[PDB]
């Protein structure tokens, strides 16, 4: 496919949003569903448009498959990639720490030369601090089930219709 999906799940929530966004792009012809427990970092290498997915239900930590991983990213050539994040959270119970893997993550990828894409408002929200907001903004979908579910559907499906320009697949 065009774009790979990696994704790393807790509680199965992230697996969920995943396959939700899969089907929002059109389906498994134009994204591919990789578990990052089952990817070797020259899986992501082989992606020109890469979304990445990652949980935070630690404080501090990031999910157990993406820090097994974290290191390896630096075997991926991220020069001239083009990478969105999402990530489940939330944002009452970790209201100072709402996102944060999400942009531990980016914080990483970007150092290595990749394109952030995706960006994503944060006034849809309610929380006090976030490592995954920049300048107003968060450097990708912030997915809440337990205090929004209702919000996800819509949030996909326009997070998705952006990057869709982002990614050269508008038309
Ligand atoms: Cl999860
Ligand atoms: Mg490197």
Same mark, same amino acid.
């Given at each position: 496919?065009?774009?790979?999906?990696?994704?790393? =799940?807790? =509680?199965?929530?992230?697996? =969920?949003?995943?396959?939700?966004?899969?089907?929002?792009?059109?389906?498994?012809?134009?994204?591919?569903l990789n578990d990052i427990a089952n990817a070797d970092a020259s899986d992501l290498n082989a992606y020109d448009y890469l979304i990445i997915g990652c949980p935070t239900w630690?404080?501090?930590?990031?999910?157990?498959?993406?820090?097994?991983?974290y290191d390896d990213l630096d075997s991926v050539n991220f020069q001239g990639k083009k990478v969105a994040y999402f990530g489940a959270g939330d944002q009452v119970g970790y209201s100072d720490n709402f996102? /944060?893997?999400?942009?531990?993550?980016?914080?990483?990828?970007?150092?290595?030369?990749?394109?952030?894409?995706?960006?994503? #408002?944060?006034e849809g929200y309610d929380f006090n601090e976030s490592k995954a907001v920049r300048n107003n903004q968060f450097?990708?979908?912030?997915?809440?089930? /337990?205090?929004? #579910?209702?919000? =996800?559907?819509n949030?996909?499906?326009?997070?998705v219709s952006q990057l869709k320009s982002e990614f050269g697949l508008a038309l």
């Open positions: 496919a065009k774009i790979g999906l990696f994704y790393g =799940t807790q =509680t199965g929530v992230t697996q =969920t949003i995943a396959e939700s966004i899969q089907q929002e792009f059109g389906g498994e012809s134009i994204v591919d630690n404080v501090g930590e990031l999910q157990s498959d993406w820090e097994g991983i996102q /944060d893997a999400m942009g531990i993550l980016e914080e990483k990828i970007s150092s290595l030369g990749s394109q952030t894409v995706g960006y994503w #408002p944060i450097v990708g979908l912030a997915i809440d089930e /337990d205090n929004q #579910p209702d919000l =996800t559907k949030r996909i499906k326009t997070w």
